[PDB]
């Protein structure tokens, strides 16, 4: 957990859900990210997918909104470190509903940044790598 923040990271310090840490902007982003409706706990199964991580994995919509929230924040240095630790180190994935992937378009470092699909079959929930910060 970050010095001066309540919500950013596993576990939490806060007493009420309305309470925010030192930084008005970064802690709001982390609070919104930690209140994602659809998550998957460690070892939880949902939507035909099983996550095999000790940390909870979240939906790609929450991660995209969290990315935009951190990139548009006013306090640059705290949001910078939170983004560079969450998105770029742990090598997590996000799950969303998409046509079945046929192959990876562009793979840079250990992650696929553009993928390709078959438009012929229906949509299914699948894992996708997270963009870097």
């Amino acid at each position, epitope marked *: 957990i970050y010095p001066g923040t309540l919500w950013c990271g596993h576990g939490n310090k806060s007493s009420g859900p309305n309470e925010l840490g030192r930084f008005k902007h970064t802690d709001a982003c982390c609070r919104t990210h930690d209140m994602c409706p659809d998550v998957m706990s460690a070892g939880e199964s949902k939507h035909g997918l099983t996550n095999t991580a000790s940390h909870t994995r979240l939906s790609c919509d929450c991660d995209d909104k969290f*990315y935009d929230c951190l990139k548009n924040s006013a306090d640059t240095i705290s949001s910078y470190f939170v983004g560079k630790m969450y998105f770029n180190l742990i090598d997590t994935k996000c799950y969303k509903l998409e046509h079945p992937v046929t192959g990876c378009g562009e793979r840079t470092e250990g992650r696929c940044l553009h993928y*390709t699909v078959d438009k012929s079959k229906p949509k299914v929930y699948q894992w996708f790598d*997270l963009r870097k910060y």
Partner: nanobody
Amino acid sequence: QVQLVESGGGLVQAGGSLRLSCAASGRTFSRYAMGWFRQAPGKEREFVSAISGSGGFTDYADSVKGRFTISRDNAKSTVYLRMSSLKPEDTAVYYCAAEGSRGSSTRLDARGTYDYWGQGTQVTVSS
């Protein structure tokens, strides 16, 4: 704030060659993929081409594979769509689009991948 502006277009005879150029401004250019979308009168604005930030992966729509070429100049922050051997049923409005900021990986085969769009220029094949 960002600004995407096109150049090129108009009427050209069947078989002729034309390239549209699209200049972006406001942010870093090389990070974000960019693409070109084709809207015929009375149809969904479908994508015709897209190119990644690095340039190493491009995706073309099946209707136009092998006739169009896509490229970018990161120093001038521009993207070029070259077109050759134009055929009927290809006259349309061509829009220039840029990949928005995303936390997850996205496909270039979707409208929802691109946030910033230009006004686009008309392309007319007449003979």
